[PDB]
Amino acid sequence: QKPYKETYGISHITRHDMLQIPEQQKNEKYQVPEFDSSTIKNISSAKGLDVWDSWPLQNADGTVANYHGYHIVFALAGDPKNADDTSIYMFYQKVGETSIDSWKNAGRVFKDSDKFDANDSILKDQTQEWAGSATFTSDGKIRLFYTDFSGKHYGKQTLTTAQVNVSASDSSLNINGVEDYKSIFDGDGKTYQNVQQFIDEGNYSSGDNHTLRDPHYVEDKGHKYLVFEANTGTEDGYQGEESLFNKAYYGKSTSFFRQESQKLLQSDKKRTAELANGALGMIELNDDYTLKKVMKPLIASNTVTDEIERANVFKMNGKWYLFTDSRGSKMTIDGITSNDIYMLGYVSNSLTGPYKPLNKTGLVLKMDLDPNDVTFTYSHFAVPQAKGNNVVITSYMTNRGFYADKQSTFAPSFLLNIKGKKTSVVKDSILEQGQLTVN
Ligand SMILES: [Ca+2]
Secondary structure (H helix, E strand, C coil), rough: CCEEECCCCCCCCCCCCCHCCCHHHHHHHHEEECCCCCCCCCCCCCCCCCCCCCEECCCCCCEEHHHHHHHHECCCCCCCCCCCCCCCCCCCEEEECCCCHHCCCEEECCCCCCHHHCCCHHHHHHCEEEEEEEECCCCCCCEEEEEEEEEECCCCEEEEEECCEEEEECCCCEECCCCCEEEEEECCCCECCCCCCHHHCCCCCCCCCCCCEEEEEECCEEEEEEEEEEEECCCCCCCCHHHEEEHHHHCCCCHHHHHHHHHHHHCCCCCCHHHCCCEEEEEEECCCHHHHHHHHEEEEECCCCCEEECEEEEEEECCEEEEEECCHCCCCCCCCCCCCEEEEEEEECCCCCCCCCCCCCEECCCCCCCCCCCEEEEEEEEECCCCCCCEEEEECCCCCCCCCCCCCEECCCCCCECCEEEEEEEEEECCCCCCCCCC
């Protein structure tokens, strides 16, 4: 077929941009820090469990929250030897502490008995509790969103939520039970990808990747949304051979494309490309947290890579930032090796409109450390603060399943300066093994 530049009304991750990221990502303003291991210890509260991808119960706008003189958190958490055992436990601390050991673990959020009591068709096939957000409601409640996926229906990722009825005490914090347990979204097909269309390619064999996870809860003018990791559906320009001919996914200029589109496909990977069709997405909710509108995705990684992960977004010092973590490993951009790993940033004047990379590449943070390294760190998450130009970068250290007395723990959070549309790792800011703040 011939050339077309169509941007579908939304922004995208041009490849051009993604092509400076091999030169620019060598500047240290943009580089996660070498951490010290003689420091890193594991989690008391957890108990030999591995613990990665985590979120903090936060407020309306971004900031961590005070649910009763208490800092709270939400991690994936598994039996190290089980690559299919995922579950959302709930660690939590006091609100004046920093120390890793300040983190009592409150137990698996959910009862095995739960998926059923729920009354959610899609929910009784759930076989793994993946990641999301956790707001904290104006009427003092705990509202959780997370990934409802199942390895039985081909890895269908679904949009799930629940309130976390729970009681607090001057010293501890237990979990009575949960309610308002329902699944919101499973993909709509024209705009995002539902597990049916991933099966039409054969499913996994096909080679293509299906993701619908990490709903970030936020709100602007009292409208409260969910922004996630996804894949372009079938109208918001979609994965295909066709795919590679739209100049919207190259950017820079025509004639640029003509080289790249050419290279390319003359690739060793025309394909890993045609199928890479990912996105950070949007949808609206009702105060009962039911889907209200499916909205246009906020961005697409069209051709670069089919799996943007751990999506974020929030207003800070007046403008809207938005993010994501992703594995260079799984992208098609020369000079971005399989050791590469990232968090990316886009900004806009308005939550829903139009996100131009930060740093001019939307590169904000790169990380390479060999996988065996004890200081590997994945999922870096940009936590907003009351004010200041810094936000706190969280992550989980050390890989799930590698060492045998070393376990998916919290790697030291740290700092990051952001102002305007430029960021910069703040030099020498390593805070505590999990600090969610600074105050
Ligand atoms: Ca895909």
